[PDB]
Amino acid sequence: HEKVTIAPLVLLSALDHYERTQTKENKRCVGVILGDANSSTIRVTNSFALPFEEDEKNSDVWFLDHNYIENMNEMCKKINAKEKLIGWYHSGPKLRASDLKINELFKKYTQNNPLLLIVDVKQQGVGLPTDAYVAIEQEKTFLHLPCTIEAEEAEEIGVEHLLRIRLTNQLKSLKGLQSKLKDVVEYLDKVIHTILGKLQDVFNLNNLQKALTVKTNDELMVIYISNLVRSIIAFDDLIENKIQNKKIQEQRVKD
Amino acid sequence: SATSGEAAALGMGLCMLGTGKPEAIHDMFTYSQETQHGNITRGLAVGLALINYGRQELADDLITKMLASDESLLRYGGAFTIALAYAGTGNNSAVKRLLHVAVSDSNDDVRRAAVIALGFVLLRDYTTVPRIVQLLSKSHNAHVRCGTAFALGIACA
Amino acid sequence: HPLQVARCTKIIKGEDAKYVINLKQIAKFVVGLGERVSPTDIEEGMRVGVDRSKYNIELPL
Amino acid sequence: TKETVYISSIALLKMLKHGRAGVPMEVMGLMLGEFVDDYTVNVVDVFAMPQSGTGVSVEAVDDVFQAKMMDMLKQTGRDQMVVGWYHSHPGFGCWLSSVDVNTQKSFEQLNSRAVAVVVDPIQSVKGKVVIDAFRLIDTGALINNLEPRQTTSNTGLLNKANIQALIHGLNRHYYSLNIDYHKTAKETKMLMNLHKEQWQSGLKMYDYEEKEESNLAATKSMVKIAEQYSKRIEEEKELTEEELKTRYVGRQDPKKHLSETADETLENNIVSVLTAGVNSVAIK
Numbered sequence: 001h002e003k004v005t006i007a008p009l010v011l012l013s014a015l016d017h018y019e020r021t022q023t024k025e026n027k028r029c030v031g032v033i034l035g036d037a038n039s040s041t042i043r044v045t046n047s048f049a050l051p052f053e054e055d056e057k058n059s060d061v062w063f064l065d066h067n068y069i070e071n072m073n074e075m076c077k078k079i080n081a082k083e084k085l086i087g088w089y090h091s092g093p094k095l096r097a098s099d100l101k102i103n104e105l106f107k108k109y110t111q112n113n114p115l116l117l118i119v120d121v122k123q124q125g126v127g128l129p130t131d132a133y134v135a136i137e138q139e140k141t142f143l144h145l146p147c148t149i150e151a152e153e154a155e156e157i158g159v160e161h162l163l164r165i166r167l168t169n170q171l172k173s174l175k176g177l178q179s180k181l182k183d184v185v186e187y188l189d190k191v192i193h194t195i196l197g198k199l200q201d202v203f204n205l206n207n208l209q210k211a212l213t214v215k216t217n218d219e220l221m222v223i224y225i226s227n228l229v230r231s232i233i234a235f236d237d238l239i240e241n242k243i244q245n246k247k248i249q250e251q252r253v254k255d
Numbered sequence: 256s257a258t259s260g261e262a263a264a265l266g267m268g269l270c271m272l273g274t275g276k277p278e279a280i281h282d283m284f285t286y287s288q289e290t291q292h293g294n295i296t297r298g299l300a301v302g303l304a305l306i307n308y309g310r311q312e313l314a315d316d317l318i319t320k321m322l323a324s325d326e327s328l329l330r331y332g333g334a335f336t337i338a339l340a341y342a343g344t345g346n347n348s349a350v351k352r353l354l355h356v357a358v359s360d361s362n363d364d365v366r367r368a369a370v371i372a373l374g375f376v377l378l379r380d381y382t383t384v385p386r387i388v389q390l391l392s393k394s395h396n397a398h399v400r401c402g403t404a405f406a407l408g409i410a411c412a
Numbered sequence: 413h414p415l416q417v418a419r420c421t422k423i424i425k426g427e428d429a430k431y432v433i434n435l436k437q438i439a440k441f442v443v444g445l446g447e448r449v450s451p452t453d454i455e456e457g458m459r460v461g462v463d464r465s466k467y468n469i470e471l472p473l
Numbered sequence: 474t475k476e477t478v479y480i481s482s483i484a485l486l487k488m489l490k491h492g493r494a495g496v497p498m499e500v501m502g503l504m505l506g507e508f509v510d511d512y513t514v515n516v517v518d519v520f521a522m523p524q525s526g527t528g529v530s531v532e533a534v535d536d537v538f539q540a541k542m543m544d545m546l547k548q549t550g551r552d553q554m555v556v557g558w559y560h561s562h563p564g565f566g567c568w569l570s571s572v573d574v575n576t577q578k579s580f581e582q583l584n585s586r587a588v589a590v591v592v593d594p595i596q597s598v599k600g601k602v603v604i605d606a607f608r609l610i611d612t613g614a615l616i617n618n619l620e621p622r623q624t625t626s627n628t629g630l631l632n633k634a635n636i637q638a639l640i641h642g643l644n645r646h647y648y649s650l651n652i653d654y655h656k657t658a659k660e661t662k663m664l665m666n667l668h669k670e671q672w673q674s675g676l677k678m679y680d681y682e683e684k685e686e687s688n689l690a691a692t693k694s695m696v697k698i699a700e701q702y703s704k705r706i707e708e709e710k711e712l713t714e715e716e717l718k719t720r721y722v723g724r725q726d727p728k729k730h731l732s733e734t735a736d737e738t739l740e741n742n743i744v745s746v747l748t749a750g751v752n753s754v755a756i757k
Contacts, residue, residue: 008668009486015659016483020517021550045490051548068545075542078523079491079500121659127675129663148672154489154598159668161602162485162654164361166751169677176676206757216753223749226693229700230742237735257511293512325658422571426526 002040004115004132004145008159010047011130011149014119017049018091027054028092029119030102032069034076037086037112043150044117046083048072052090059097064105087115093122103135116142126172257294264298268305275306280317293328300332307340311349314340322352327362334365338372345376357399367402374409381410418461431455433467442468475620476514476586477651478606482660484516485602488592491521492561496596499529499570501560503539504590505546505553511618515655517553518546528572529560531579559590566638569593569605577609585614588648602652610646624651678751685748696741703734 010033017029034046053063073085088106090099095118106114116133123129133142180199187195206213256263264283271279280303287299303321307314314336321333334353341349350373357369370391377384388403420432431454433441447469454460460473484504491500506517520542525533546552558580562570569591580587593605621627626649632640641647673680710730714721 008664009483009490011667012482012486012660012663015663016481016518017550019657019659049549049551068548071541072545075523075538079521080493123662129667149667152489152493154594155486156668157598157600158485158489158602159664161600162482162656163664163668165677166747169751172675173678206755209755220749220753222693223689223745226696227742227745230738230745233700233703233734233738234742237731240731257509257513291513295512325661424528424572426528428526 002042002134002145003148004117005041005043005148005150006117006130006132007043007045007151008149008155009151010044011119013047014049014089014091014130015121018119018121021049023091026056028052028090030064030088030090032073032088032106033086033115033117034073034083035086036082036084037115042086042115042145044086045080046076047089048076054098060101062098062102064102066105069106070109085110086112087117089117089119091119091121093118093120093124100140103140107135126175257292260292261294261298264295264302268302271302271306273308274310275308279306284317284320287329288324288326296326296328297332300329301335304332304335304339307336309342310340311344311346318352322356327360327365330356330360330362330365331368334369334372338375342375343379345379350376363396363398366396367398370399370402371406371409374406378410384410415459415461416463418459418463420456420459423456425455429455431460433460433462435461435463435465443470444468474511474618475623475649475651476508476510476588477512477623477653478514478516478588478590479653479655481516481654482656482664484519485654487519487521488559488561488590488604491519492592492595494524497563498524499560499562499572500524501529501533501558503555504557504559504588505551506556507554508556510586516556518551519559529562529570529576530572531575533576534558555587556584557587557589561595562591563595564591564593564597564605566636568644577607581609604650604652606648606650607644608648609644610648614646621649624649678754682752686752699737699741703738706730707734 014029014031017023017031021027021029023029029049030052031047031049033044034048035042035044050068051063051065055061073083076083085106087110103114103116114135116135118131118133120129120131128147130147132145132147134145135142184196184199209216267279267283283299283303283306287296300321303317307317318333318336318340321329321336324330334356337349337353353369353372353376357366360366360369370388373387374384377387384407388407391399391403394400417435419434419436423432424430431443433443448454449470449472454470454473462470462473488502491502492498494500500521502519502521504516504519506515508514522534523538525535527533543552558576560570560573562573565571577589580589588606588608590604590606593603626647628634629640634640635643639647707730710726
């Protein structure tokens with residue numbers, strides 16, 4: 001399949017247009033990603049906003065200027081020639097009816113399958129403040145591609161200069177069953193099987209490990225054998241340092 | 256104002272010395288997060304430290320708001336608020352708060368301002384002053400030794 | 413005034429009026445696009461030269 | 474005080490992206506925002522310019538391309554005051570750009586407080602993030618606040634400062650750049666949780682479980698060799714010394730080999746324990 005690679009330059013750029021424009025919950029900042037969608041690895045090296053206006057009274061009313069779309073994409077070619085139109089990004093926590101009608105706009109100048117991106121300034125719950133989706137039809141069918149972040153050498157190192165485990169893993173793992181339980185109950189009363197079929201595939205696949213439980217305990221003992229030997233090595237240094245500490249005390253008594 | 260406006264925040268704190276009034280506490284604190292200026296906030300941070308003198312636990316409401324904020328400018332003057340209010344008779348919980356800021360926070364100016372505030376609380380008993388700064392006298396950071404020099408010289412002058 | 417070495421060091425202008433012909437083995441350059449004749453100063457003046465290797469179209473200096 | 478440049482989150486990343494094409498080549502840009510002396514200095518938005526044939530000069534900037542782009546700053550909320558022109562150069566010892574001379578002198582006419590920023594490393598990247606600038610002074614700029622007293626100025630012990638091709642003059646007058654950074658509460662919340670090493674995050678259990686367990690059989694054999702060379706060093710250490718004095722230029726002999734038998738042992742055991750706790754965690 002394909003994967004979406006979002007550079008930290010793009011994630012931080014979309015967060016800037018939200019605060020500078022004083023965008024409230026009634027508006028969502030829309031922008032255009034730039035990159036190469038030809039290969040299986042989709043990387044976005046550039047992002048910019050657009051004068052978008054949102055209307056909550058009518059989902060079919062949106063203000064977008066196509067002149068600024070083609071001009072800015074042409075003027076930014078002088079920087080890097082690898083930047084083309086692979087899709088667009090927009091703000092807001094949720095996908096409303098106005099987002100479905102604006103999907104067919106950029107598809108005229110886009111060759112391959114466009115890429116959609118949702119930027120969340122609040123980042124409420126779990127991970128992934130920016131979720132990526134693909135727009136394709138047979139009815140609109142959206143698929144969530146794996147979201148990864150990879151930058152250049154100077155870009156990844158520059159983040160560390162500006163900033164100069166097990167418990168968290170168990171908390172998010174427990175919340176996965178709580179969030180899935182609410183999705184099944186709400187969908188049960190919504191119908192009164194296709195959506196629940198995909199969740200049943202993952203949920204079904206000492207229950208099945210009973211055959212490997214005997215062989216698992218034998219491997220855990222071998223792991224402790226290495227840990228027991230390394231523990232003795234650390235214990236020898238404690239006695240060696242205790243004798244070494246006395247040599248310093250013996251010099252303090254004579255001198 | 257970047258010149259005369261800084262003296263306004265510092266000039267009001269001199270008339271507000273003593274117990275002070277709770278109305279000036281919220282107004283000077285909210286203005287710091289509304290308009291963003293370094294010298295104004297430092298003028299307010301020192302100002303908010305001057306308006307609280309000898310209040311001890313009574314000033315803990317304003318102290319909590321300074322420790323919860325991630326802004327280094329508000330936390331820079333937060334040590335002086337604990338220093339003046341807890342000056343003289345010291346508190347085991349108040350001293351623990353000043354020592355906790357210089358550890359977790361990585362700002363060199365805040366770590367320096369945190370240990371200087373320890374001198375105002377220890378003004379009565381100067382025997383424990385050189386013992387606290389002795390362990391901080393040897394460190395890999397250069398700014399750790401900076402604040403320990405004055406805090407040792409405030410009481411022992 | 414005899415000069416046996418004609419070379420510049422890191423001189424880049426523009427497109428037109430760049431030139432900088434270097435006789436040294438490292439970073440040789442040539443200038444095309446018709447004939448260009450200047451009375452005194454071609455690009456930097458002074459060290460402008462040809463010597464043993466004739467570079468394209470410039471006789472006059 | 475002076476003007477201390479505060480680089481935002483996007484201001485640092487775009488400078489590396491604009492000069493991304495070529496080591497020897499060069500680009501430029503325009504810094505934006507509004508600020509007042511005595512503290513506030515900020516750069517809101519940055520944008521590059523196309524590379525011309527003249528390199529970087531007074532004719533390098535295109536007023537036609539600038540005016541056509543400037544009209545797009547207003548509708549997007551990007552419109553701010555121009556506080557300077559940032560460039561990108563390969564860099565030299567002194568005067569990092571040999572083709573840049575008459576630009577800043579024409580820039581100081583509009584605003585005397587405007588500066589110019591250039592990214593120093595350009596393949597020299599280190600991780601201290603050393604960035605360079607220049608600002609002209611000439612006559613004037615005195616009878617004002619204190620420029621040097623801000624950050625580590627009033628220097629010149631021997632000749633050593635910065636690149637040490639500068640001493641007093643630098644480019645002109647020793648503008649004494651000060652590079653800091655300030656971010657909002659939302660920007661600081663991101664890079665702390667987002668940037669760690671790579672992205673396995675949100676579930677650490679099964680992502681590296683199969684990858685580490687598959688190589689655990691080979692890891693068990695490789696950690697055994699490290700212990701084999703451990704005691705062999707300590708055995709020859711005490712065998713050759715009957716003195717307990719120094720003729721041996723051994724000023725610290727033991728602690729180096731003692732830490733090699735400790736820190737390595739301390740490294741190999743913790744990765745076989747802390748990871749072993751989450752290596753199963755099956756329950757039911």
